[PDB]
Nucleic acid binder design. Structure first.
Ligand SMILES: [Mg+2]
Ligand SMILES: [Mg+2]
Lengths: 44, 116, 109, 53
RNA sequence: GUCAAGUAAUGAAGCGCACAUGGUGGAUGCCUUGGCAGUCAGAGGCGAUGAAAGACGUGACAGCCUGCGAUAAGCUUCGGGGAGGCGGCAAUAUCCUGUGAUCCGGAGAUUUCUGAAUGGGGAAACCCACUUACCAUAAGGUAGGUAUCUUG
RNA sequence: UGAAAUAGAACCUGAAACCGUGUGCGUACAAGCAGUAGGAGCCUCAAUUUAUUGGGGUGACUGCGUACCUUUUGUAUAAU
RNA sequence: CCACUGUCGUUGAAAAGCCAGGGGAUGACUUGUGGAUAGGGGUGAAAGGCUAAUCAAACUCGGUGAUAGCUGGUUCUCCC
RNA sequence: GGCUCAAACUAGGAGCCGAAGCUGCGGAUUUGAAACUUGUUUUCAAGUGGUAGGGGAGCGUUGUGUAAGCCUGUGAAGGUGUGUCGUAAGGCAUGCUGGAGGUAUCACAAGAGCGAAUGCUGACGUGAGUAACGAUAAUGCGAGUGAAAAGCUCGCACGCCGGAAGAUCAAGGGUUCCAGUCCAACGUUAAUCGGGGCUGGGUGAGUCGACCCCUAAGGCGAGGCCGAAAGGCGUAGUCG
């Protein structure tokens, strides 16, 4: 049956992407937190 | 000062498993089962140190009864005859004489029977 | 003396190879080779390969007469297990042991 | 539906006291002299003094 | 020697216990390249001269890590040093080196693209420009400039 | 080769659970926490002027004997 | 597109299916792509339904080692 | 079991069995009492079942000092046997293994002792060589290659789909595509085969699509409005 993840690149990059993170103060805090943890993947 | 438990735990478990040599299955191999089997073995041994003194008197009395009935007396009359004759020979020695020296036990029966 | 061959790491369960080993233990080299070449068990190909290697060792490295040889001792030991995941129904997983075995054969007079 | 205690290794091996590999009957072919499974042709096609290839 | 009556021993499909000898496994002991808590001092920022963080490249040599940026394991210079050397996994080849290499310290040069990202836009590492000067004659190349806000 | 290779690369040491092989003894008429107290026989080392003791392995046969923890008034408990 | 009945399956082929039947099938229809509404909030032809296999208050992190008159566990030895 | 002038009952008598009770013998220990008097000695008397719990005395382990000591390649720690000593925790010696450390004694400090917590991690059992091998569209044989062929290739025959189980895409994936080579692992079996490993190759546009021009929903939004801050809204626009 239909499952929860239905991938779409535009939708992924528009809800979770780098510019979407940088558009908000809270998204920039997400990025600051990911960089402080040292993640090799900042954004999808 | 961190203490590792490995070496002492090992030697501790080896003492128990060594006392459990010859037991069946897990009882000689695995510690949780061996340690109960060793404790129960000690409990049985403590109880049977007491019970062995009862069992051997049981055996001596049986042999003395047989020896006396061979000579025409029961155990309860033979022991009474010994106590009346002031003979202090214990049941262990009397059973030994009855088993391994029939003529001497005949003589003892004669003494008891003369005392009655 | 006793000449050894080892077949460490055969991709099969030692419980399976043990039935083959029990039938060739103590027999002469010829009888044992007959049993192994006409067995229908997979473990027999491994036991036969190890036995052939041991015979060749006894003939080349020790100069023994393979006419008087016999399977002096044989045993199978457990090898390293490969661990795999088996999916089951309802999203539950099982572990799978892909067992291997070590075959030791010693031939001698 | 499942065991209430693990089986002992002794009982596990008594249940395997009937496991046994099958041993084939063998004969010598009269013509070639070769060993073969009884009532089966040799690896090279001989059975009871008769070629097959 | 027959018969009768009575009564031993021997058995192992397999299994148990002990010992011997292995397999598996990776405890223990020893060890350390890594951590943890402080003391005495220093310092307390980096960034429009483009940061932090990245993407993509870059080698004689396929990948990754390290360094570096189309001048791409590096270029110039100033000092140190004196025999080896071309970063690691990790060697191999061509070679360099007393005409002083590799290496270390100071300074400089180069420094792609993204990112405050700042010419506009955007699903970051992409798309699309305007303009000044010069060169080319074709469909471009080189060097710049072009965000917003505040204060003058 | 190496001092060493059951130091051979899954590599120092290499425990236990677990699984083999070998040797000795026991075990196919007998009912249960598998031990314990006795105890025959066998096997094996030593003595000993030579089958007797001592040590080790096994244990026919007899008596007794319903795990452990927790929690309970109270548990072999068919309670955890 | 849906999901009325039954068998099967229930450590499934499947964390909701298969098979045989069943309903709607030009409509208040189904469906693609993009977008909007966010947690005491949303959305709901209303079942407390649904809001990423999570819903009478999502998820993640933090307060936080919440609190727990409750349950479990609590490790060497001997003497009074 | 079996029992009938009992092996039942009543009333008496004499023997004996019978407990970890009492006595005997040996040993330990608590308290008290007496004396060479901080165990220095001997005694004596009364004691010594024990949960919750109170009191007393110790064992071992890691680490610090003692210790620039002492031990140790003539073999440390650890492992694994054996012998021996102590009431116990445990100590001592020693064979084998091991191959570089250990630590007397007395103090001192604890990450100081595990069988349980449906405890945590890893390893390995039992179930058991048991269930299953994922659509009942289906296979047979001959050749080839190969260590090996039911499964690969080729051939003949058979069967299945055919509003697909054929073909073209979008989305999503990202090399899976093609050739050669390999068969450990992966593939629910084998495999010479593969969407597996390894090495090479392969994607060619003015017209197909994107980019680009344009806008929808909906975003962002010089100035502007609003709001403790953060921010929220919104014009022109700019994206989509
Ligand atoms: Mg090792
Ligand atoms: Mg849901």
């Amino acid at each position: 049956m239909k499952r929860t993840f239905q991938p779409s690149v535009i939708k992924r990059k528009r809800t979770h992407g780098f510019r979407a993170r940088m558009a908000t103060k809270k998204g920039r805090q997400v990025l600051a937190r990911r960089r402080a943890k040292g993640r090799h993947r900042l954004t999808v | 000062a961190r203490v590792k438990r490995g070496v002492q735990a090992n030697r501790r478990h080896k003492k128990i498993l060594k006392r459990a040599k010859g037991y069946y299955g897990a009882r000689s191999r695995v510690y949780r089962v061996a340690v109960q089997a060793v404790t129960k073995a000690g409990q049985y041994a403590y109880r049977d140190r007491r019970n062995k003194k009862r069992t051997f008197r049981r055996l001596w009395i049986a042999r003395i009864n047989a020896g006396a009935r061979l000579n025409g007396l029961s155990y309860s009359r033979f022991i009474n005859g010994m106590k009346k004759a002031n003979i202090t020979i214990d049941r262990r020695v009397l059973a030994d004489i009855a088993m391994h020296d029939a003529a001497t036990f005949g003589a003892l029966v004669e003494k008891a029977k003369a005392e009655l | 003396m006793e000449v050894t061959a080892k077949l460490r790491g055969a991709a099969i369960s030692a419980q399976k190879v043990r039935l083959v080993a029990d039938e060739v233990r103590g027999k002469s080299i010829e009888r044992a080779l007959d049993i192994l070449t006409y067995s229908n068990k997979k473990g027999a190909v491994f036991v036969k390969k190890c036995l052939n290697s041991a015979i060749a060792n006894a003939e080349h490295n020790h100069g023994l007469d393979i006419d008087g040889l016999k399977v002096a001792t044989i045993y199978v030991d457990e090898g390293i297990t490969l661990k795999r995941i088996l999916p089951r129904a309802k999203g539950r997983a099982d572990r799978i042991s892909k067992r291997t075995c070590h075959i030791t054969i010693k031939v001698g007079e | 539906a499942v065991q209430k205690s693990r089986k002992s290794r002794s009982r596990r091996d008594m249940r395997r006291s009937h496991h046994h590999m099958t041993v084939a009957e063998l004969s010598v072919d009269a013509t070639t002299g070769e060993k073969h499974r009884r009532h089966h042709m040799t690896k090279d096609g001989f059975y009871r003094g008769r070629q097959l290839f």
